[PDB]
Enzyme design. Structure first.
Site, mmCIF file in Angstrom:
data_model
loop_
_atom_site.group_PDB
_atom_site.id
_atom_site.type_symbol
_atom_site.label_atom_id
_atom_site.label_comp_id
_atom_site.label_asym_id
_atom_site.label_seq_id
_atom_site.Cartn_x
_atom_site.Cartn_y
_atom_site.Cartn_z
ATOM 1 N N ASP A 136 0.788 -1.288 0.063
ATOM 2 C CA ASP A 136 -0.085 0.062 -0.224
ATOM 3 C C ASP A 136 0.862 1.102 -0.024
ATOM 4 O OD1 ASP A 136 -2.396 1.326 -0.125
ATOM 5 O OD2 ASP A 136 -2.600 1.446 2.084
ATOM 6 N N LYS A 138 1.870 4.777 -1.416
ATOM 7 C CA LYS A 138 1.125 6.010 -2.043
ATOM 8 C C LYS A 138 1.614 7.127 -1.360
ATOM 9 C CE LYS A 138 -2.718 4.591 0.671
ATOM 10 N NZ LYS A 138 -4.066 4.522 0.815
ATOM 11 N N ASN A 141 1.186 7.380 2.429
ATOM 12 C CA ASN A 141 1.945 6.581 3.182
ATOM 13 C C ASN A 141 3.618 6.870 3.037
ATOM 14 O OD1 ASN A 141 0.138 5.133 4.454
ATOM 15 N ND2 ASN A 141 -0.263 3.710 2.953
ATOM 16 N N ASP A 157 2.788 2.912 7.913
ATOM 17 C CA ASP A 157 1.732 2.027 7.575
ATOM 18 C C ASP A 157 1.985 0.745 7.138
ATOM 19 O OD1 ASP A 157 -0.953 1.177 7.595
ATOM 20 O OD2 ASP A 157 -1.865 3.054 6.767
ATOM 21 N N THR A 176 -4.600 0.500 -3.233
ATOM 22 C CA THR A 176 -5.375 1.826 -3.266
ATOM 23 C C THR A 176 -5.564 1.874 -5.080
ATOM 24 O OG1 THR A 176 -4.580 2.494 -1.306
ATOM 25 C CG2 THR A 176 -5.640 4.269 -2.921
#
Ligand SMILES: Nc1ncnc2c1c(-c1cnc3[nH]ccc3c1)nn2C1CCCC1
Ligand SMILES: [Ca+2]
Ligand SMILES: [Ca+2]
Ligand SMILES: [Ca+2]
Ligand SMILES: [Ca+2]
Length: 462
Positions: A136, A138, A141, A157, A176
């Protein structure tokens, strides 16, 4: 041996979170649970805690984070479990999300984007080496450490991260819309998903827009699963080919055809710079590392504890730059050859001749530094190992830090460190009598079979 690692120090507490921390404000919500800026009640230090309801069971994110030590990865201090809750205390990064800077500055300098992506790729190169996939990645994060101009980047995260095997492939759909790799949608993927995501991030940094877009979540995922993107936009006329080349390689549809993190680091483009160090600072650091003399395990744990858990970001910003520059290949580890070139690099800065150098003499000296400093004996000097060692010893061994370390080690408050307490510190059943004998023989002043805060104090103060 007993491998001294930062992770070993994060242990399951049996005190109440509330006894030692105080909520200040909400920073936000994570993958699952919210993050609360807290203050240590006694030292007033700020951390970012993640709270997780037991009702909403795995503390997986804790175990992963203990195995990671990297200048561009989130640091974990300790963690508390409750009747109803988990608390994951972590270092707080005060530059906020990359996301916000993206929507602010709009478009990134190739220089700035290369630096940022380099650190992200470095984090994952390291992770992938240790069998961990983030899943994840992005701008949400990725945090800037502080408000300074070209602030360091941290990955955060790890709540959706997992261990992966080269043997068996992952199936769960995680990520995501903008950033998710097609193969995660398909249902079978490996660590290369992390590359794809980072490739998406890179695209955004350089152009301001995502490479796959849509009216809503659903539209985007179809666009993503088709894989097609373009460099057709006018702002791309300002970007260099190699940057696009790297992007192509990172977003190659087929995982097996897509570049690995480790290889991406070596790409031409990511060596884009303009940024230098004072000689004195570098010299201090190099000299402190050379002069670190190996020692008994009580001292090792103590120093590493102080260096890895008791130093603030403000204190390590210069040390952090140096490490990255000495890490030519980006992997988040200093190796013998990297170390050798560091000293040489400094030697050029001092005018001394490169040709007139006993390469083998240096290489020998470097082998011995490595031996002294490599706390966990993995053949590599990791960031926290480096900090502990390279920081000015009077700065590190501030009278505070000393007191604080001893406190942590003397678990039963007896005012004396026992071997059982040392075993506890190392996360292991018992300390080899050999080791402890070795430990007392160098430290025990009254000779009562244990180490008190004066015995402790002088141990390190050498
Ligand atoms: N450590 C942090 N420091 C500063 N800001 C942080 C965070 C986190 C965050 C991210 N991952 C975490 N895992 C365990 C605790 C924890 C905290 N999240 N955030 C903000 C709140 C969510 C978006 C940014
Ligand atoms: Ca390296
Ligand atoms: Ca090491
Ligand atoms: Ca004790
Ligand atoms: Ca004693």
């Amino acid at each position: 041996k007993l491998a001294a690692t930062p992770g070993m120090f994060v242990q399951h507490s049996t005190a109440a979170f509330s006894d030692r921390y105080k909520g200040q404000r909400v920073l936000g919500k994570g993958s699952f649970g919210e993050v609360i800026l807290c203050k240590d009640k006694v030292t007033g230090q700020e951390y970012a805690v993640k709270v997780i309801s037991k009702r909403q069971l795995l503390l997986k994110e804790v175990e992963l984070l203990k195995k990671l030590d990297h200048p561009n990865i989130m640091k974990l201090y300790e963690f508390f479990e409750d009747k109803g809750y988990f608390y994951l205390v972590t270092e707080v990064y005060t530059g906020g999300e990359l996301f916000d800077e993206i929507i602010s500055r709009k478009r990134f300098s190739e220089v700035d984007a290369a630096r940022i992506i380099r650190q992200v790729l470095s984090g994952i190169t390291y992770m992938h080496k240790n069998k961990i996939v983030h899943r994840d990645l992005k701008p949400e994060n990725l945090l800037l450490e502080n408000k300074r101009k070209d602030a360091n980047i941290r990955i955060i995260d790890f709540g959706l991260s997992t261990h992966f095997e080269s043997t068996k492939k992952m199936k769960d759909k995680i990520g995501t819309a903008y950033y998710i790799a097609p193969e995660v949608l398909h249902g079978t993927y490996d660590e290369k998903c992390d590359v794809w995501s980072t490739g998406v991030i890179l695209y955004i940094l350089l152009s301001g827009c995502p490479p796959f877009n849509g009216a809503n979540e659903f539209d985007i995922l179809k666009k993503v699963e088709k894989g097609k993107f373009t460099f057709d936009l006018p702002q791309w006329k300002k970007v260099s080919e190699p940057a696009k080349d790297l992007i192509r390689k990172m977003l190659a549809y087929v995982p097996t055809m897509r570049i690995s993190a480790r290889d991406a680091l070596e790409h031409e483009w990511l060596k884009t710079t303009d940024d230098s160090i004072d000689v004195p600072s570098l010299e201090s650091t190099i000299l402190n590392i050379r002069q670190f003399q190996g020692t008994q395990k009580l001292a090792a744990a103590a120093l590493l504890y102080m260096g890895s858990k008791l130093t603030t970001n403000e204190e390590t910003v210069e040390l952090n730059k140096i490490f990255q520059r000495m890490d030519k290949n980006g992997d988040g580890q200093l190796d013998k050859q990297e170390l050798m070139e560091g000293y040489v690099e400094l030697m050029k800065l001092k005018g001394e001749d490169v040709s007139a150098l006993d390469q083998s003499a240096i290489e020998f000296e470097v082998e011995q530094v490595l031996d002294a400093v490599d706390f966990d004996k993995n053949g590599f000097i990791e960031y926290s190992e480096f900090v502990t060692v390279a920081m000015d010893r009077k700065t590190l061994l501030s009278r505070q830090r000393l007191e604080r370390a001893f406190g942590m080690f003397d678990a039963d408050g007896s005012g004396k460190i026992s071997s059982s307490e040392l075993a506890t510190i190392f996360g292991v059943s018992e300390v080899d009598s050999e080791t402890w004998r070795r430990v007392l023989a160098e430290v025990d002043r009254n000779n009562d079979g244990e180490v008190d805060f004066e015995e402790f104090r002088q141990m390190l103060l050498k």
